[PDB]
């Protein structure tokens, strides 16, 4: 017999044909999938009186459990079944309501922002509804749907109720961001942006995807704060961190200016670092869960030896600050001392007038002041061997994976910013953001500048050719520029940064898949010219989009502080050693763009930055950012079961892919990063990778660690993010 309990409470009887038809529907177009196998595995779990939702979840999981590299299409079988279940759970039926009826209901419920009904008429919502293709819900993989269900779709946390589907998410994000546009272009932009995101060509960050269309205005996820050498600034910095981490932001903190232990502030940097750490974790579950920061200091700081070991799990508590990451700032001079086997002299920034500023802004002035202060016997100093200091840094980098490098000279000689006016003196949490800052003397200091950046990414696997990036850059740049005027600003100094410079950070995902389908690899130099061509196109079209936006709406108030304003382009200032590793010519008219930028300006002081991805790439079934995948199948733990995702087009490209640990070394990847950096406005979250089993006695030599560090510098790499060590 087998009775089934409906959503109302009544007991109907089991319809095996109806289940079979839904599975048949979900199987359309898929290969190597067995419907009977899914039926056998789920139907054995059915019991008399099982409720309808449980039958749905049982067959979804049944399909999900069969995801493998041999049968990847189970990814899409499970997703479609999950999508079907999500439709009923939200709408009571497969077919979604009319957009207008949906929006009115959701505003009534207080789940959508009422500005939507003010800004658009019923007839415009009717028109927007014609743009929507709800069948694009069938293009998500299972891992994608899980991400949408848990993080993206508007829902009730307490009751578990889901209120929308993915195409309503996409259309309304588009509608909100383009809402202030004139009626002649408005719905044209809405339609094209909708198409771009719903077909995975553009990826948006989680705060946008989850919050844009809702009553929230908290969308800032990336904040850069510079601390001055005063209690007033330390207190302002801490206060600003607390406000931002309560809104879920990642933090980059520059604390390099704080004077060393024993200075005539007597007690040193570490107690203040501890206070920054507690600010960072002030809105976290149990001292860890939530809130994250990376803190920056120069390699020559007097306390550096103590600072390097702050996350070493074997030490005394008053000399450990383990729950922040760290970025060590280095320039040519430091590296030269390493090569020559000489000393590096350590100074407190308070003792060395102009040294700190020159470190970022002027390498000639740095060397003049450094050697001058080295000779001066009245200046407090400590001398250490360069080989020893570098080894300590790299030891801690290797053991934690979270001691980062910033080449501050590269960040300022090859930069959208004039370092005499607006130097880049730190980075963010993930080491791809590179923006000017100014210390605050109070939380509400109007003369301070906290850097903010709004992110997105192009899906390199979803474009058929590079000229498609013209339209996509227009959509991406305009959508994010609109977000800047839309979002809230809890701290005046951060609003100053965002409104003054209008900084954007648009990157990529699916790079590994992109190389695979072009038959290229990371490790052998085969992707060098393709990478050069690709990132020329990205930067060219991003600049063109922002240049055109400036013609239309005006350049950013602080455009005059950019190298762009002076008619200087990234193609003039790149690390010249790149000329030896790629011969690819420029394919776009940069000379015309140069004059057009100098005349009409840019709406946005920066446009590009290469961030890591996880959530965004999962939703598009893309490889993560610019990274090669570790394996063909990704695994994540879930309450709903083991979540698997197979790399895109494994069936045809498994041999074309180069997995992370199949790389013999870091050289090839680092050359690719250098080539990208020629064009990128900010930086790149570049990883280094080491497999102990590739080395004699199973231990990674310091020689190689330093060699790769030096290779990175030589090719103009601005930052180094995670060091990954293969376990085993």
């Amino acid at each position: 017999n087998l009775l089934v309990t409906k959503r109302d409470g009544s007991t109907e009887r089991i319809n095996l044909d109806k289940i079979h038809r839904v599975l048949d529907w979900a199987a359309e177009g898929l290969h190597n999938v067995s419907i009977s196998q899914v039926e056998l595995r789920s139907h054995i779990q059915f019991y008399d009186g099982i409720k309808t939702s449980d039958i749905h979840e049982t067959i979804i999981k049944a399909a999900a459990d069969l995801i493998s590299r041999d049968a990847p299409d189970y990814q899409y079988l499970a997703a479609r079944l999950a999508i079907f279940h999500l439709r009923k759970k939200a709408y009571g039926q497969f077919e979604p309501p009319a957009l207008y009826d949906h929006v009115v209901k959701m505003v009534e419920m207080g789940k959508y922002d009422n500005h939507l009904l003010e800004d658009y008429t019923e007839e415009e919502f009717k028109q927007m509804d014609t743009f929507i293709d709800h069948d694009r819900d069938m293009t998500f993989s299972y891992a994608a749907v899980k991400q949408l269900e848990g993080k993206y779709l508007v829902q009730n946390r307490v009751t578990g109720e889901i209120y929308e589907s993915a195409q309503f998410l996409y259309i309304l994000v588009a509608a909100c961001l383009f809402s202030n546009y004139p009626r002649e272009t408005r719905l044209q932009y809405v339609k094209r942006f909708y198409d771009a995101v719903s077909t995975f060509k553009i990826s948006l960050p989680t705060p946008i995807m989850s919050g844009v269309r809702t009553p929230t205005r908290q969308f800032s996820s990336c904040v850069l704060i510079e601390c001055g050498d005063s209690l007033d600034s330390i207190n302002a910095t801490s206060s600003a961190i607390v406000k931002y981490v309560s809104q879920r932001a990642g933090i980059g903190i520059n604390a390099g200016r704080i004077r060393a232990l024993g200075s005539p502030f007597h007690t040193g940097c570490i107690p203040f670092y501890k206070h920054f750490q507690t600010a960072v974790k002030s809105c976290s579950q149990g001292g860890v869960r939530g809130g994250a920061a990376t803190l920056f200091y120069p390699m020559w700081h007097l306390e550096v030896e103590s600072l390097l070991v702050l996350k070493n799990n074997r030490g005394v508590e008053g000399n450990r600050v383990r729950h922040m990451d760290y970025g060590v700032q280095i320039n040519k001079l430091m590296y030269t001392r390493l090569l020559k086997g000489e000393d590096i002299t350590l100074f407190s920034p308070s003792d060395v007038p102009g040294l700190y500023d020159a470190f970022f802004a002027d390498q000639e002035e740095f060397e003049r002041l450094y050697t001058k202060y080295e000779k001066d016997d009245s200046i407090r100093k400590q001398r250490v061997k360069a080989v020893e200091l570098f080894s300590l840094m790299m030891q801690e980098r290797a053991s934690t994976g979270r001691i980062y490098i910033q080449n501050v000279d590269h960040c300022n000689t090859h930069s959208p910013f004039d370092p005499a006016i607006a130097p880049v003196r730190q980075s963010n949490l993930c080491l791809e953001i590179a923006l000017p800052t100014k210390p605050l003397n109070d939380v509400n200091d109007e003369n301070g500048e906290i850097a903010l950046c709004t992110l997105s990414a192009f899906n390199l696997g979803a474009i058929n050719n590079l000229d498609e990036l013209e339209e996509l850059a227009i959509l991406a740049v305009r959508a994010l520029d609109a977000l800047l005027d839309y979002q809230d600003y809890p701290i005046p100094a951060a609003k100053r940064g965002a409104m003054g410079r209008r900084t954007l950070g648009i990157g990529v995902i699916n790079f590994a898949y992109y190389l695979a389908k072009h038959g290229k690899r990371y490790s052998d130099g085969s992707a060098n010219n393709l990478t050069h061509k690709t990132f020329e196109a990205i930067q060219y079209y991003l600049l063109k989009a922002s240049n055109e936006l400036a013609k239309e709406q005006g350049a950013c108030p602080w455009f005059n502080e950019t190298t762009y304003a002076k008619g200087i382009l990234p193609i003039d200032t790149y690390k010249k050693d790149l000329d030896t590793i790629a011969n690819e010519p420029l394919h776009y008219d940069w000379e015309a763009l140069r004059e057009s930028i100098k005349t009409h300006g840019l709406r946005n002081s920066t446009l590009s930055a290469l961030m890591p991805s996880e959530t965004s790439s999962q939703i598009s079934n893309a490889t993560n950012g610019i990274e090669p995948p570790r394996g063909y199948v990704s695994i994540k733990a879930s309450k709903d079961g083991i979540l698997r995702q197979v790399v895109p087009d494994y069936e045809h490209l498994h041999d074309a892919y180069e997995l992370l640990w199949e790389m013999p070394g870091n050289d090839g990847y680092l050359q690719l990063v250098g080539i990208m950096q020629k064009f990128i406005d900010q930086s790149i979250s570049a990883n280094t990778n080491y497999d102990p089993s590739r080395f004699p006695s199973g231990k990674v030599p310091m020689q190689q660690l330093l060699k790769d560090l030096l290779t990175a510098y030589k090719f103009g790499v601005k930052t180094l993010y995670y060091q990954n060590t293969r376990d085993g």
Partner: peptide, 16 residues
């Protein structure tokens, strides 16, 4: 673990 062996003469060749 890591091998702490550093050849400074091997590095002295490199140009930044």
């Amino acid at each position: 673990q890591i091998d702490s062996e550093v050849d400074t003469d091997d590095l002295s060749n490199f140009q930044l």
